[PDB]
């Protein structure tokens, strides 16, 4: 390809943007102080910009450096990955919902499910995103419910579920919406420190006596907010796990 490089932001260059297309551009990319317009070949423009030819896929460039995400006893695989090991495969294509498995919090949640989920448990996966944890819970023999306040991730979670041969409920909403489906034996919430702290008394309300709450999404420094709220709510602490800057705090109730 060729690039026409123009100085300014899309909004500042607005007036002349249709001109660049008329000219034969395929796409505009706002970059630091410039708009890059992509063309097949140079074509001589009135717009005061400057041309660069650019290196020659991009398809086999993102794919190629994206690897199975190991979270024992699971591995999170994209559809084209292959795996020899004995890990339980969770097939999840990197798509438009968080929970592709390439984050610390997702992987700490997965490992924590293995340590806590007794066969038969009813599991509430609060903040389901790609549905990866609810799917993990069914793989472990638990009956799972994924809820998310964002309706856009739900068809995605259903589709990840279908590929992986399991069928957890998914519905729109939060804790409130989940309550008639419970109480639960296990709750796993990959969210963030403040949200948990606000939901603590209600995490209690959702769990049967004896159940566990596995909380993550929590930045290491923000952890006290959570240790505090959960202590307030009556929970008794279990292990903590960390990776990078994130913690998973487990609690029994």
């Amino acid at each position: 390809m060729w690039v026409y490089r123009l100085k300014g932001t899309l909004e500042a260059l607005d007036p002349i943007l249709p001109g660049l297309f008329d000219g034969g551009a395929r796409g505009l990319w706002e970059r630091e102080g410039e708009v890059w317009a992509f063309f097949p070949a140079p074509v001589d423009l009135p717009y005061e910009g400057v041309w660069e030819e650019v290196g020659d896929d991009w398809l086999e460039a993102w794919r190629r450096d994206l690897k199975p995400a190991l979270a024992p006893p699971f591995v999170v695989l994209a559809p084209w990955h292959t795996w020899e090991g004995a890990e339980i495969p969770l097939v999840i294509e990197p798509g438009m919902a968080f929970g592709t498995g390439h984050h610390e919090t997702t992987r700490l949640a997965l490992k924590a499910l293995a340590r806590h989920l007794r066969p038969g448990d009813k599991v509430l996966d609060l903040g389901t995103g790609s549905g990866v944890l609810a799917i993990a819970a069914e793989k472990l023999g638990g009956k799972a419910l994924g809820v998310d306040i964002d309706p856009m991730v739900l068809p995605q979670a259903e589709a990840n579920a279908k590929r992986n041969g399991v069928r957890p409920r998914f519905l729109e909403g939060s804790l409130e919406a989940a309550l008639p489906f419970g109480p639960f034996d296990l709750l796993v919430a990959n969210l963030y420190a403040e949200l948990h702290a606000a939901l603590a008394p209600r995490y209690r309300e959702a769990l049967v006596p004896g159940g566990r709450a596995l909380l993550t999404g929590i930045l290491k420094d923000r952890a006290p907010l959570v240790r505090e709220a959960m202590a307030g709510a009556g929970f008794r602490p279990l292990e903590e796990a960390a990776e990078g800057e994130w913690v998973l705090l487990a609690y029994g109730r």
């Binding site: 796409g27 505009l28 706002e30 984050h103």
Partner: protein, 121 residues
């Protein structure tokens, strides 16, 4: 959902491909460019020939999200008398100065030199 990047592209409806700009703009954060192509083309297989500003919000785990904005006055015309009082209410969720009538005159003035012709207020 930790944000690593918010990419401002501008693209022809239905025409997104994995070639630049999409390839490198989302490729460099390791977002599935293919999902984006197919998703962006699906949500705009509609708008015919237009030019769609789209923000892509890429997250820490390589997943992303995308919002399309509404296209320019220009295409959004295709002369005309006053019905810009019918585009200038199909401009707002499409513009920036809820002066309802502060658009009309702008769009119109513009509308004209397009130039599709006048009969307005």
């Amino acid at each position: 959902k930790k944000v690593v990047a918010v990419v401002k592209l501008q693209l022809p409806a239905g025409k997104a491909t994995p070639a630049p700009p999409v390839g490198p703009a989302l490729g460099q954060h390791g977002a599935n460019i293919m999902e984006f192509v197919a998703a962006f083309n699906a949500a705009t297989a509609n708008m015919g020939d237009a030019i769609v500003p789209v923000e892509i919000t890429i997250y820490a785990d390589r997943s992303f999200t995308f919002v399309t904005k509404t296209p320019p006055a220009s295409y959004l015309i295709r002369i005309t008398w006053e019905q810009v009082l019918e585009i200038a209410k199909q401009k707002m969720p499409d513009l920036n100065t809820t002066d309802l009538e502060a658009a009309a005159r702008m769009i119109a003035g513009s509308a004209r030199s397009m130039g599709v012709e006048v009969v307005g207020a």
